[PDB]
Amino acid sequence: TPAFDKPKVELHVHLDGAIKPETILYYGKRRGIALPADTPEELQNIIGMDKPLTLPDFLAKFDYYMPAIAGCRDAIKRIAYEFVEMKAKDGVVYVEVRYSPHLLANSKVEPIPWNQAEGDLTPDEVVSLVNQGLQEGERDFGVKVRSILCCMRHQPSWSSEVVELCKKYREQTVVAIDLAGDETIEGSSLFPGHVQAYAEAVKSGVHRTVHAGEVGSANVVKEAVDTLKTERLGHGYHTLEDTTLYNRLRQENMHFEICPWSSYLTGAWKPDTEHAVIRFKNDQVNYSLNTDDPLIFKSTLDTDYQMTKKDMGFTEEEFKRLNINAAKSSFLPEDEKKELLDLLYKAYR
Numbered sequence: 001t002p003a004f005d006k007p008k009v010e011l012h013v014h015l016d017g018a019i020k021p022e023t024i025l026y027y028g029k030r031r032g033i034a035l036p037a038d039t040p041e042e043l044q045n046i047i048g049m050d051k052p053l054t055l056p057d058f059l060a061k062f063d064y065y066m067p068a069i070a071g072c073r074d075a076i077k078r079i080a081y082e083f084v085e086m087k088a089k090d091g092v093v094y095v096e097v098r099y100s101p102h103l104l105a106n107s108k109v110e111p112i113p114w115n116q117a118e119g120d121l122t123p124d125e126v127v128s129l130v131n132q133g134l135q136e137g138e139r140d141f142g143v144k145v146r147s148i149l150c151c152m153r154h155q156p157s158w159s160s161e162v163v164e165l166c167k168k169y170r171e172q173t174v175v176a177i178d179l180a181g182d183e184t185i186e187g188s189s190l191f192p193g194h195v196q197a198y199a200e201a202v203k204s205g206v207h208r209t210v211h212a213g214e215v216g217s218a219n220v221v222k223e224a225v226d227t228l229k230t231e232r233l234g235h236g237y238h239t240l241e242d243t244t245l246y247n248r249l250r251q252e253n254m255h256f257e258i259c260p261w262s263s264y265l266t267g268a269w270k271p272d273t274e275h276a277v278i279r280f281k282n283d284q285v286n287y288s289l290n291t292d293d294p295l296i297f298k299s300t301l302d303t304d305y306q307m308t309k310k311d312m313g314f315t316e317e318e319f320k321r322l323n324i325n326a327a328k329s330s331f332l333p334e335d336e337k338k339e340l341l342d343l344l345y346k347a348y349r
């Protein structure tokens with residue numbers, strides 16, 4: 001069945017979008033919340049999309065399940081644990097996983113997300129709990145995991161906390177800072193809370209990625225590159241819109257975190273068009289293949305590989321260079337990055 005039967009690298013996946021239905025129900029019941037279902041299968045049917053939707057439509061998906069995990073400590077550790085399990089089934093030898101700590105928390109955060117009564121779970125120990133779950137998963141399932149911590153567009157006040165959390169927990173497991181959630185809010189790349197967070201990340205050596213370009217213009221890409229100093233782009237589809245920018249990113253060997261299946265389901269790509277990744281294939285761009293939200297998009301990594309092999313004529317050779325590009329563009333220290341490279345060179349021959 002699987003389009004690509006070798007080990008794989010993945011750089012772009014959200015933890016809060018990669019929970020098993022079954023364990024949301026488990027915590028729905030056991031805490032009180034009660035979902036719009038009580039069977040795993042129907043749960044995935046309504047909390048999981050299969051044709052494009054608007055943003056409010058999208059966000060209410062989170063409004064369903066997040067109150068069931070956020071706040072509960074053992075929930076937070078278990079989803080980090082089960083994320084590694086899920087990934088071992090995908091054949092991934094190395095993954096970076098991202099999330100917003102604040103969104104899993106029910107105290108020391110204004111506003112309190114998900115409506116949610118107060119309590120005592122702060123952002124700081126959310127990240128310790130996640131990174132316990134993750135370290136255990138690594139040990140039991142033999143996938144290597146690191147994590148990225150997301151800033152949120154609409155909430156520049158969280159952002160100095162995020163860089164500080166990145167520093168406190170560096171190497172183990174957290175390797176980078178991200179910026180997520182609605183790149184359409186005007187001027188959001190340039191909100192002072194975000195820019196000074198990213199400037200702190202330069203100063204102290206935390207690695208940087210930015211979501212720019214999925215649903216927004218090439219201008220928001222440009223700000224991510226020139227003002228936020230990204231090392232990578234999540235998505236970056238719209239840099240095509242601006243050809244000098246595109247060419248520049250080609251020379252600098254910028255890495256696009258591509259999420260094929262997602263981009264259909266979000267509206268970012270319309271089916272009757274050039275998919276941006278085929279252009280990236282033809283141009284020999286430094287890009288990767290990623291799942292984004294396997295919960296919400298009813299998908300595994302093989303969904304993404306499959307789609308590009310069926311409908312876009314991707315071949316096995318391109319699959320290889322892409323995962324190599326992803327290993328090179330990882331936020332691993334260089335010794336550990338050479339080790340990963342070596343594993344992959346052998347596996348691939």
Ligand SMILES: NC(=O)c1cn([C@@H](CO)CCn2ccc3ccc(NC(=O)CCc4ccccc4)cc32)cn1
Pocket residue numbers: 014015016017053054055058059062098099100150180181182183214215265266267292293
């Ligand atoms: N794929 C994602 O965008 C995503 C974001 N998360 C969470 C962090 O890990 C945060 C969820 N979240 C909270 C507020 C918020 C605002 C916007 C978005 N995402 C977008 O706007 C992405 C673009 C988009 C447009 C329209 C439909 C779907 C998606 C996520 C948001 C999980 N998955």
Ligand SMILES: [Zn+2]
Pocket residue numbers: 012014234292
């Ligand atoms: Zn994403």
